[PDB]
């Protein structure tokens, strides 16, 4: 089993693995170092990753992207519209009030939850990795934005499980980049020495994260993290597309807003113009037949682009100033500012980040790979079998969390357990006096400090098996309260004390209610995913066998006329030519859309004759070499 780190991006995902010397980037079937984060659907199979993207423009209503953003998303969330404006496919409410996609798939209308959809993508990308490693992949570390909710982390972890993976940790993405910075740099401060303070700024397709960390050799602590989840590349593409939507109404008398397909072509072209504007100060905008017969031909300057995103840019320094305040630092205490993420290549962003810290920007990591590499390192930490050079890290726990219990004989019925601005993972030990079985729960101490519309309650438990000793008043229960390496709030142990010495008596049973799926539901979704996988694989295999047959026809026909010509009788050759011709015509008829066994059989008939002739050819070839030596 080889450790596997997944940077799951809104636009693209990066795959890293821990092997040999260290950590490698896994390349996909098209040779790309990232894979488009796309799940599409067709009449026969799913289009996942690169193929999803290939089929996207001709299948927009059945192509889901933004997989990350709809995980855990309430359908009536006040900011739902900021998410759904970026969707081309139909979104629907699920039975639990969350959001799914409705899609035409295999001749039917299908509804899939965001968890399910993420699982399909994780499954594809898991197959990329095992194709590359030739090994078993059973464990993942998934990197997510620091603004991911407790619920969302559970949801993405369950998506991993539906794809047949153990989600070893769900890590904050910029923390994973910090880990890769810490395991790669060779001159970090060592003893009583002052930590190196490095600010990280990631701006991707959808999110802007700033996270400031203290580094010593073998360790990091995160000091402060702030996010704008509504600040990314897609917001730039959209501002460009809306600018041109208005310009083309006047210039061409066309209204792309009334024509989803036309609008999507401009949107796609707008990302490319955006990228040219990171390198050039001016750029032409040309799109052929955006509608029936209409070719558009315009341009945009960098200056014009900057004015287009003026409202967004008003927020440009906020994550920096907020992360510094959390860290309790002034800008001058930061030693180095590292940028990652594709959108940090926009010059106006670079200027603003530099000015906010009053520092030049450092680019000493691979910006596309750092998060994935750190996630693969973290997956290796959790491996029981792969010993890795040790690195310790703590992440920030931004909100106060309390636990409550049945009052019973206790004076208090709740307490603050995990304070605001502490670190995770963390373990706290409590002992409570108990009259019998009891309920517990974890909650946010001050809900005004959380995003709007966050439920106060995080999780709840029933503890049972409480038995009072003879002195039948109460019994002390020891509890192990845990904020785990993913920042999830658990209870991992509860037991009764004293059965001169004070020993343990009974291990107690804990029933947990979390955002995580039940075993029953999980297994039902695992089954659905296996069925869709088997169906995709059958279609890909039958497609392969049909291509292999067609290629063999042209190949064997050509050889019979050339190097095989001396090696077949008249009767053998014309017979084989007849069946080659018949097999070729069949590929246009019944064989246009046939079953796997038949493409195989048609091939074996031909090859069985072809190989007799090839055999004679090869034998005379070795004979020429026998005459040599």
């Amino acid at each position: 089993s080889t450790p596997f780190g997944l940077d799951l991006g809104n636009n693209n995902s990066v795959l890293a693995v821990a092997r040999n010397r260290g950590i490698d980037i896994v390349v996909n079937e098209v040779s790309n170092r990232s894979t488009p984060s796309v799940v599409g659907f067709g009449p026969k199979n799913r289009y996942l990753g690169e193929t999803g993207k290939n089929k996207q423009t001709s299948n927009i209503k059945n192509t889901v992207a933004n997989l990350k953003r709809i995980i855990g998303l309430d359908y009536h969330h006040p900011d739902f519209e900021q998410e759904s404006k970026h969707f081309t496919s139909k979104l629907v409410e699920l039975d639990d009030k969350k959001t799914g996609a409705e899609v035409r798939f295999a001749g039917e209308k299908h509804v899939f939850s965001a968890t399910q959809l993420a699982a399909m993508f994780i499954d594809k990308v898991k197959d990329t990795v095992k194709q590359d490693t030739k090994a078993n992949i059973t464990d993942v570390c998934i990197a997510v934005p620091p603004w991911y909710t407790e619920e969302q982390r559970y949801n993405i972890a369950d998506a991993a499980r539906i794809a047949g993976l153990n989600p070893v940790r769900i890590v904050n993405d910029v923390t994973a980049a910090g880990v890769s910075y810490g395991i790669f740099k060779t001159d970090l401060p060592e003893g009583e020495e002052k930590p190196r303070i490095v600010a990280f700024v990631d701006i991707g397709h959808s999110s802007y994260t700033c996270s400031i960390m203290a580094f010593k050799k073998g360790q990091l602590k995160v000091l402060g993290t702030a996010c704008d989840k509504h600040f990314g590349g897609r917001d730039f593409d959209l501002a460009i597309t809306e600018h041109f939507a208005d310009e083309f109404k006047t210039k061409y008398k066309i209204d792309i807003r009334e024509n989803p397909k036309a609008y999507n072509r401009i949107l796609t072209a707008a990302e490319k113009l955006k990228k040219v504007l990171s390198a050039n100060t001016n750029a032409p905008f040309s799109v052929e037949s955006v509608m029936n017969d209409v070719d558009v031909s315009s341009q945009l300057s960098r200056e014009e682009l900057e004015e287009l995103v003026k409202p967004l840019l008003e927020r440009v320094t906020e994550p920096v100033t907020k992360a510094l305040a959390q860290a309790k630092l002034s800008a001058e205490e930061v030693d180095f500012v590292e940028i990652i993420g594709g959108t940090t290549r926009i010059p106006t962003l670079k200027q603003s980040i530099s000015e906010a810290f009053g520092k030049p920007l450092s680019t000493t990591l691979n910006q596309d790979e750092a998060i994935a590499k750190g996630a693969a390192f973290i997956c290796a930490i959790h491996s029981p079998t792969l010993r890795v050079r040790p690195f310790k890290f703590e992440d920030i726990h931004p909100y106060s969390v309390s636990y409550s219990w049945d009052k019973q004989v206790e004076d208090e019925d709740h307490m603050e357990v995990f304070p605001a601005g502490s670190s995770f993972p963390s373990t706290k030990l409590i002992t409570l006096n108990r009259t019998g079985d009891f309920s517990m729960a974890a909650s946010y101490t001050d809900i005004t400090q959380l995003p709007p519309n966050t439920p106060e309650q995080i999780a709840n438990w029933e503890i049972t098996g409480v038995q009072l000793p003879e002195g039948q008043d109460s019994v002390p229960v020891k509890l192990k309260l845990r904020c785990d390496p993913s920042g999830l709030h658990t209870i991992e142990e509860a037991y009764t004390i004293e059965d001169t010495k004070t020993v343990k008596k009974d291990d107690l049973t804990i029933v947990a209610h979390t955002f995580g799926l039940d075993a029953k539901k999980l297994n039902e979704l695992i089954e659905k995913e296996n069925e869709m996988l088997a169906q995709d694989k059958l279609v890909a295999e039958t497609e392969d066998r049909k291509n292999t047959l067609e290629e063999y026809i042209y190949t064997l026909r050509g050889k019979l006329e050339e190097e095989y010509a001396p090696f077949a009788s008249d009767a053998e050759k014309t017979k084989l030519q007849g069946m080659l011709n018949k097999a070729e015509e069949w590929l246009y008829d019944e064989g246009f859309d046939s079953i796997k066994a038949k493409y195989i059989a048609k091939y074996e008939e031909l090859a069985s004759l072809g190989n007799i002739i090839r055999g004679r050819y090869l034998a005379k070839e070795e004979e020429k070499k026998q005459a040599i030596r």
């Binding site: 040779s31 193929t51 050039n280 001016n282 017969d293 049909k546 291509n547 290629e551």
Partner: protein, 379 residues
């Protein structure tokens, strides 16, 4: 301070550095792992790399590329004279040394080929420096195996102008071989064929390696195949479909063919990693939708002669080397077109199923080996 390895390519360049036991290929500030060997001159500024290449169509006379074809050559070189016919920029004669002539900042300026190349090398150097965080001063630079002393020395001069100490000028197929560790196999001669197809240009090289010592046996340059011709085959095929299905001929329609061609370029690329590809052109001709598909096997067959022709320089190289195909021990694939399955299939079937060294990105394998070699020469 690490030394860097630079593939100074005719169309694109690539820089890597050996660090922590491995080669890291370095992305430029646009995130690209290769950088166009382009230099543009405008009224106000000089542009190098992606910026230069982005504005070529709008400033074609002042955007210089292919300086590699001129470097170390004489003006009266029939190659120089021949090549000129294809460039939209001006090439002049300065005491039998070619200079590229350009408008820069409202003035006429001429540059030696090695001056243009120094600007590309300065760019690659700055890319390496941004990634490393310190000044870079030592480099291995690669050239084609067929480069003479003058072409090698002019490339070294470009290095020196760019502020680099040039540790060594090494052959490109030698670099690709070092990338795959073919120089680690101890005593005894191994014959290696490097097959380098990509970006119109085509070089086959046979090297002999013994105890990490390289000798060039042959070089064969069939260096124009790969672009429009494969596209033409798909356009003509599909024009014939529309002819068949709708009883109408779309041939004499400029916009309609360009639209069909675009779809054919996309389909071709898809067919390198999938066994089929769909085409979907709304209102292609006279308001008619053209939705169809093509298999990888069909496409290969349409282009069977164009693919088969890649073996010509292989057979030529084997002749110059005086070797039989069974005497080639090792195969190395470099250049983007070697990703095309048929290229791999033809080659592999020609050499009777010999394995291919191909796991390193074929656009990066040369910078890869130059970086390994630069580290060796430093320590």
């Amino acid at each position: 301070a690490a030394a860097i390895g630079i593939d100074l390519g005719t169309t694109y360049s690539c820089v890597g550095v050996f660090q922590h036991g491995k080669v890291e290929i370095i992305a430029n500030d646009q995130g690209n792992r290769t950088t166009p060997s382009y230099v543009a001159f405008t009224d106000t500024e000089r542009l190098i790399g992606d910026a230069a290449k982005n504005q070529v169509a709008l400033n074609p006379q002042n955007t210089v590329f292919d300086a590699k074809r001129l470097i170390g050559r004489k003006f009266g070189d029939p190659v120089v004279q021949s090549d000129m016919k294809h460039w939209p920029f001006q090439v002049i004669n300065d005491g039998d040394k070619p200079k590229v002539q350009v408008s820069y900042k409202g003035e006429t300026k001429a540059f030696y080929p090695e001056e243009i190349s120094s600007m590309v090398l300065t760019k690659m150097k700055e890319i390496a420096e941004a990634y490393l965080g310190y000044p870079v001063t030592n480099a291995v630079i690669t050239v084609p195996a067929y480069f003479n002393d003058s072409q090698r020395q002019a490339t070294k001069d470009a290095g020196v102008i760019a502020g680099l100490n040039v540790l060594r000028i090494i052959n490109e197929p030698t670099a690709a071989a070092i990338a795959y560790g073919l120089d680690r196999t101890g005593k005894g001669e191994r014959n290696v064929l490097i097959f380098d197809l990509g970006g119109g240009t085509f070089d086959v090289s046979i090297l002999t390696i013994d105890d990490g010592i390289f000798e060039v046996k042959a070089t064969a340059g069939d260096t124009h195949l790969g672009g429009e011709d494969f596209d033409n085959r798909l356009v003509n095929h599909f024009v014939e479909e529309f002819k068949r299905k709708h009883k109408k001929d779309i041939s004499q329609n400029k916009r309609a063919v360009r639209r069909l061609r675009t779809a054919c370029e996309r389909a071709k690329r898809t067919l390198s990693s999938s066994t089929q590809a769909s085409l979907e052109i709304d209102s292609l001709f006279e308001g008619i939708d053209f939705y169809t598909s093509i298999t990888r096997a069909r496409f290969e067959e349409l282009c069977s002669d164009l693919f088969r022709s890649t073996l010509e320089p292989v057979e030529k190289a084997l002749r110059d080397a005086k070797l039989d195909k069974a005497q080639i021990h090792d195969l190395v694939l470099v250049g983007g077109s070697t990703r095309i399955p048929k290229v791999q299939k033809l080659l592999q079937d020609f050499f009777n199923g010999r394995d291919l060294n191909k796991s390193i990105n074929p656009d990066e394998a040369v910078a890869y080996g130059a970086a390994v070699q630069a580290a060796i020469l430093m320590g």
